[PDB]
Design a binder for this molecule. Sequence first.
Ligand SMILES: Cc1cc2nc3c(=O)[nH]c(=O)nc-3n(C[C@H](O)[C@H](O)[C@H](O)COP(=O)(O)O)c2cc1C
Lengths: 77, 77, 153, 76
Amino acid sequence: FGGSEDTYPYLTGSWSTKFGYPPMPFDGCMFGSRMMTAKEAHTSKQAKQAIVDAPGVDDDQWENTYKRPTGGVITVL
Amino acid sequence: QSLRPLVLTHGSLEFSFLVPTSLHFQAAQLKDSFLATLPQPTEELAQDDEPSSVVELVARYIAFVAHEVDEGDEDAH
Amino acid sequence: QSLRPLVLTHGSLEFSFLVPTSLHFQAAQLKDSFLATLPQPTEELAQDDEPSSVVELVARYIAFVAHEVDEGDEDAHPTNLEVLKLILNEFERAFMRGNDVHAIAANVAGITAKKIGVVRAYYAGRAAAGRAPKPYDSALFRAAAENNVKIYS
Amino acid sequence: YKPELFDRDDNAVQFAVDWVKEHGPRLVKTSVGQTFVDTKMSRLLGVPPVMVAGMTPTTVPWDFVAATMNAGYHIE
Ligand SMILES: Cc1cc2nc3c(=O)[nH]c(=O)nc-3n(C[C@H](O)[C@H](O)[C@H](O)COP(=O)(O)O)c2cc1C
């Protein structure tokens, strides 16, 4: 998550209808990667820059991290 | 109006009885002290000079009671 | 004029009873041969498919008596129909408290089997004294006709 | 089961819950005119049901954490 627009659906219970199931509300939402570029975060300047500059990827090809430099993030051990 | 189930129970032979409601504890008493006159029951179906049939359970009881009639037990004759 | 203390005694559970002076040995007899129908008492407070509560001592007795009504024991049919009426009343009095036998069987020691044992002990003495269940509607269908709930089949 | 069709107590009727009814988001306002997206989370914690999760590098320093709680939000 990175906004209220995508958050909203789960915050509602509407996401779950797309999967042929009744509405399933969440009691809130959680933010991690998003806040990294907050000016009151210690994330270095050019770092925060390079963070934004990562072109995200949809839930579609998220698993592609395991094999490729998908978006701006890769997976590593 | 007046029916009271009295059972003569022993080992493997029983006899059922019909008693007036009124005279049911006099008949309970004679039955009670009479089932002590007999020796510990035998599941081998007989004892020497103790009951052998159901015809003997009643016969033994008839003489038991008739003895306590001629016995000097007053107020209960 | 007519009061006679009848006790249903067993292991660690008892039930007291009020009987007409007249019909007190018919009720003593059904009680007597009924306390032999049960297996040797258990001070461990339960046996498998034997009494589990005091609600089961009366239930087991209601079906015991109601069975000897429909059983071919003659000359003694009028008197058994009376022991029956008393146990039925004493049961709907204290145990069911007006409520149906099913929702009051739903609160006894769970074997998922003895909960059935009480519910049939009832409709055995219910029909052995010829009474047809009073047309109540459940809190469910009541609130269904009161359009709170929509019941499908 | 069976006994749920023949009961006389008023409490004897059950309603299967719709999580939308039970856990659906809501809005509410304070005696000083704040607005809170009402959820089990926000009502528990006592703040907006949006929360910054604890993250080693960035969520470690006492600034970002106390500054984010001063901004009225739940952070780890
Ligand atoms: C730099 C970084 C450090 C993290 N440290 C922790 C941690 O110490 N304990 C934990 O339970 N999750 C940790 N997480 C993951 C988050 O708690 C959270 O579950 C996740 O980041 C949310 O996914 P998102 O980044 O796509 O919003 C960390 C994530 C990042 C990017």
